[PDB]
Amino acid sequence: TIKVFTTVDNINLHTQVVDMSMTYGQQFGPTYLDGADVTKIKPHNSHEGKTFYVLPNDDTLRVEAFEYYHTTDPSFLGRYMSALNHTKKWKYPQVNGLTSIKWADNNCYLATALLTLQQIELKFNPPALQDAYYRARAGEAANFCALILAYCNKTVGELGDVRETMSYLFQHANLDSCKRVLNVVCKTCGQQQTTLKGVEAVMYMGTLSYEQFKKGVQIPCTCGKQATKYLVQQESPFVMMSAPPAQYELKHGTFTCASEYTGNYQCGHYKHITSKETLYCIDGALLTKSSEYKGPITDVFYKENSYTTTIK
Ligand SMILES: Cc1ccc(OCCN(C)C)cc1C(=O)N[C@H](C)c1cc(-c2cccs2)cc(-c2ccc(CN)s2)c1
Ligand SMILES: [Cl-]
Ligand SMILES: [Cl-]
Ligand SMILES: [Cl-]
Ligand SMILES: [Zn+2]
Ligand SMILES: [Zn+2]
Ligand SMILES: [Zn+2]
Numbered sequence: 001t002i003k004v005f006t007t008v009d010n011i012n013l014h015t016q017v018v019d020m021s022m023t024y025g026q027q028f029g030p031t032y033l034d035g036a037d038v039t040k041i042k043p044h045n046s047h048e049g050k051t052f053y054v055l056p057n058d059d060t061l062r063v064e065a066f067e068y069y070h071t072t073d074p075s076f077l078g079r080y081m082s083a084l085n086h087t088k089k090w091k092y093p094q095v096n097g098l099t100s101i102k103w104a105d106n107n108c109y110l111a112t113a114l115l116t117l118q119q120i121e122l123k124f125n126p127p128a129l130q131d132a133y134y135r136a137r138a139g140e141a142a143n144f145c146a147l148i149l150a151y152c153n154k155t156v157g158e159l160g161d162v163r164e165t166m167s168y169l170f171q172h173a174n175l176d177s178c179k180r181v182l183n184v185v186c187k188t189c190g191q192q193q194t195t196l197k198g199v200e201a202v203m204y205m206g207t208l209s210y211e212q213f214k215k216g217v218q219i220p221c222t223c224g225k226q227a228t229k230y231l232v233q234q235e236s237p238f239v240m241m242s243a244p245p246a247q248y249e250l251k252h253g254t255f256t257c258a259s260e261y262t263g264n265y266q267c268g269h270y271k272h273i274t275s276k277e278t279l280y281c282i283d284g285a286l287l288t289k290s291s292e293y294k295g296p297i298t299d300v301f302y303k304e305n306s307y308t309t310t311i312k
């Protein structure tokens, strides 16, 4: 018989004593050791003193689970420990001072998401996302990538969209202070102004150029008259301009970072473009610098503080 520790958050540890006769699944229930499902493994002698992850079996550990993860989904813990099993085996090299991921199990969209988050100002609501965020910026993003897969309901090897991944992450972040008012000018319906807050205030699908969104885009109205939806005010620390993959010229200093997508729908590859003193191209561990860039771009990230248009 040995003494081990069970926890749901790895912050509040609960001490337990197990017996060699019964497996972990008998006493604790579903138990995981650093990602490995040890529900069907009997306690070995080298397990004394180690910390174990267990699904909440009483109301005390149910609350500790929400305090750290902000979810009551029982399958969340299983998916998270399943994703951690391959993410802890990935390589996370430092590419130009940023933490990237070497290609493995179709993680090109995770590497682009990781590199992007290190360049935008974001505060996660779940403490598990925030603590792993800080650890990712240091250079240990294994737990962070596992949580992204869990929160996005994706599995390892699955094909993921960087915009959809960011969309899920923004809903678990504090964007309540973000606002965006728009003005749609219709030739028949007249003038109508809407106001977006939260996640829908920092994302737009249709164009990549933030200047074009300021000048106005042609969106169809119900009567057929193409309204010129232009941005009026934007109080957000960043904006994401998304558009279907198309050839786009990127210039250093005009944007923060971009997502390159090459290949067919869903079965393709993601490369991350970032702007410094010169344009950099990060593909896993590979790095390519250039003064100009032209290629297929799906998302472009810009910086913002407090903007008000000059169009009436
Ligand atoms: C790589 C990947 C994984 C999953 C995925 O799941 C989409 C389904 N999800 C609604 C749940 C999508 C993709 C993916 O391929 N992603 C890129 C950025 C992409 C490619 C294309 C292409 C068209 C022709 C050749 S490549 C189009 C898009 C669009 C996004 C929004 C649109 C509005 N019409 S088109 C995105
Ligand atoms: Cl919540
Ligand atoms: Cl949340
Ligand atoms: Cl910018
Ligand atoms: Zn407790
Ligand atoms: Zn929450
Ligand atoms: Zn949630």
Ligand SMILES: [Zn+2]
Binding pocket: 086, 105
């Ligand atoms: Zn693997």
Ligand SMILES: [Zn+2]
Binding pocket: 085, 086, 089
């Ligand atoms: Zn694996």
Ligand SMILES: [Zn+2]
Binding pocket: 186, 187, 188, 189, 190, 221, 222, 223, 224, 225
């Ligand atoms: Zn109209």
Ligand SMILES: [Zn+2]
Binding pocket: 106, 107, 108, 109, 268, 269, 270
């Ligand atoms: Zn890939």
Ligand SMILES: [Zn+2]
Binding pocket: 271, 281, 288
């Ligand atoms: Zn490139």
